[PDB]
Design a protein around this nucleic acid. Structure first.
Lengths: 60, 60
DNA sequence: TTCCTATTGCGCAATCCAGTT
DNA sequence: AAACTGGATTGCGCAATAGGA
């Protein structure tokens, strides 16, 4: 059954390559969402800043 | 020389360990961040909402 | 148990990158 | 400039071992 070794390896080195490739991609995606969230975020910081300037104007 | 080689190996194996851990790292860091981000952004929309009604109402 | 794949840590070699001689 | 260092990164296979029919 050492006659299985190799065949099994390759069967493995391919499963590896796959897993990894997957991972890397899942990061990218995750990585990406960070930028999407940082977009929303500043959007809000500025927005809030705005409303604030507003009541600060209005009231005081 | 030989050990010449085996030591340059030793060296690299470590740079490799280090560098791989720093990446395991960054990869988490990001996870964490994608969280504080989701939370932050979210408590920020609720602040805009809150801050707004305070305006509709402080107007007429 | 029994097979397969999936995932992980690890080492080799080739590069890549800077700061050097 | 042009080869030269020496760590950092990265593609790649190996082996152990987690998982889930």
């Amino acid at each position: 059954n050492s006659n299985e070794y190799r065949v099994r390896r390759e069967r493995n080195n391919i499963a590896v390559r796959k897993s990894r490739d997957k991972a890397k991609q899942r990061n990218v995606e995750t990585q990406q969402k960070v930028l999407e969230l940082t977009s929303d975020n500043d959007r809000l910081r500025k927005r809030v800043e705005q409303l604030s300037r507003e009541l600060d104007t209005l009231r005081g």
